[PDB]
Amino acid sequence: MENQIKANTKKEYDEWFKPYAEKTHLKSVLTNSASFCDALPDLSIFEVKMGLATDDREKDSIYACAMVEATKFCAPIYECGWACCTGMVENGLKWFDKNKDVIKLWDGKYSDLMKNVPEPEQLVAYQRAAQKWRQDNKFEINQYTRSLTHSVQADYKVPGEYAVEVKEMLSDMVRRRNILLNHVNWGRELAAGKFQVVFNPPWGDINKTGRSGIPLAVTSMVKVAELDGHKRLEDIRKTLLDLKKWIEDNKDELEDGKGDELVKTLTKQLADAIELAKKSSALRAQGAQIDSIFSSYYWAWKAGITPVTFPTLSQFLFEMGQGPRGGKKMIKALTNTPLKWGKKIISLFAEDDFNGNKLYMHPGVLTAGRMSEMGACFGVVPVSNPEDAVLGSGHSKSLLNYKIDTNAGNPCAKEIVQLFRIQKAGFDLDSMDIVASEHLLHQSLVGKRCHFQNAYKVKGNATNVEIV
């Protein structure tokens, strides 16, 4: 069938949504954007099932079922409709055909990023690409679809009963952060105050470039930040100051134009380095930050989805959330479908043959598991029959739509803990590079009240906050 969410503007989409919302009887008691949630899922049965299981594939199935129950009815319907309306589908997809250059750094090295950790500039490219998308396509239409730019609130309130286990989650996250944290001598010399090294770089000219056309000066400085820690780039600003006072105190011994042109060039290179380093320190710390909707449309586009064929993607991803139908069941279904995009999606999947911590897989690379991203965006309202959404479909990032409000008794944090308990019962977590419930809680900490929010420009440390 065809995409029933016919809308080419926020206006037209609103004109669609008023009768639809009235029909499906939406609710706001326990969730930020109005959802199908009338009551808070009790996931306790799954601890029990879990605690009584033997092989880990049974345990995986159990956890997947609890995730479906937790999120089946809490998805932000209004935003999901809007992410999936006909104008959005048409424009969100063709956006990529217009912007081949804005995405070349990663897209053009996609095959490589299925196997290796990305360079900082590939991450800078992806995050700015995402912003362009949200501007170009007019995506940000309210709070729950906005890019967040606030800073990590020092405070996080949780009910008594849960405030324990939350702090326990906090502890392991802190533990984890530490195990992740814990032409280059040029940079280290420039930082210790030996500015004269800028007169004579070991690689040649100071303006000289390398990979991605970044100046060797800059990559040297980023690499010094990466090893001797962040605060060292500021020793280099103090050093550039000593350089400047040098030239000013001895302008005589320098060629006419040169000297001012040197300090300017260097100053810029420091600014560039700080901005590149900070991307790296963040990736190292907390792993890739996927912009769900932007990557969803990127993957749809690379698979070759069209507005014509989009409703089959929506239906597929909707079915996928009606029980444990991810993993090998999904791959098999995608392998079997007569639709071309099926096998094209599969070939986007990064092999588990990945050179490095999975945390650092570039957020524009697809995996079987990252299909939950396309689910939370495309598989909540099935655009061929919108009104079937009332049945539910469980995708994990839907959980961010749960209210934080101490009013509702922070259901978001309740569900995260419950899921956490279930994960404890079946697994030794120290063995996994990622604990799903910890990643979710981290996103709540950073202030995501909805997964259609881009939170990259949020400044702070989420692992260092106070659980009231």
Automatic annotation (TrEMBL):
GO cellular component: a single term: ribonucleoprotein complex
Pfam families on file: Nairo_nucleo
Stored InterPro entries: Nairo_nucleocap
Subcellular location: Virion
Keyword Ribonucleoprotein recorded: yes
Similarity field: Belongs to the nairovirus nucleocapsid protein family.
Subunit structure, as described in the record: Probable homooligomer; forms a double superhelical polymer. Monomer.
Function: Binds dsRNA and ssRNA and probably participates in the packaging of viral genome. In the dsRNA binding mode, the nucleocapsid protein specifically binds to the vRNA panhandle secondary structure formed at the termini of viral genome. Does not discriminate between viral and nonviral RNAs through ssRNA binding mode. Displays dsDNA endonuclease activity that is sequence non-specific.
Protein name in the entry: Nucleoprotein
Native species: Kupe virus
